[PDB]
Write a protein that binds this ligand. Structure first.
Ligand SMILES: [K+]
Length: 75
DNA sequence: CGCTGCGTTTTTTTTTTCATGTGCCGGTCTCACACGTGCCTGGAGACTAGTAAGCGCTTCTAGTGGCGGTTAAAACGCGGTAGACAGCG
């Protein structure tokens, strides 16, 4: 029972939810609690992690700024 | 393997029909406005009379300046933070 790396947890959930707009923080957060396991902050962690993927170019942004909008996978 | 574009399949947006409720015209029937008539009460006349109120005069209050002094209170401005407003699901 463990929370693998920010990205190694989102990678797993965004991966099972095909969408033309993609997957958006609300959706993602609802997955992790569903099947995996966590205490809390997670949601605040998920945001910074997704911000790390925005800047670098790991996970694209569909529409919106910060942790508001839709965030897909690499290619 | 990775990309890249380019025909495909779908989505978005445009244009044209289309089925809907609108308010628009012109003929029938109803009971409500308007008239009227006749009776009765409440307004008018007029004069009486008694008292309220308005004007001037008496006083004296309580309202309007005005004079500085000290302080508490406004002013102003700078600095940052949390709350207003938009945007996403
Ligand atoms: K007075």
């Amino acid at each position: 029972t463990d929370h693998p790396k920010y990205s190694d947890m989102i990678v797993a959930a965004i991966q099972a939810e095909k969408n033309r707009a993609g997957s958006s923080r609300q959706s993602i957060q609802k997955y992790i609690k569903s099947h995996y396991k966590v205490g809390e902050n997670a949601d605040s962690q998920i945001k910074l992690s997704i911000k790390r993927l925005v800047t670098t170019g790991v996970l694209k942004q569909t529409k919106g700024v910060g942790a508001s909008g839709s965030f897909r996978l690499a290619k």
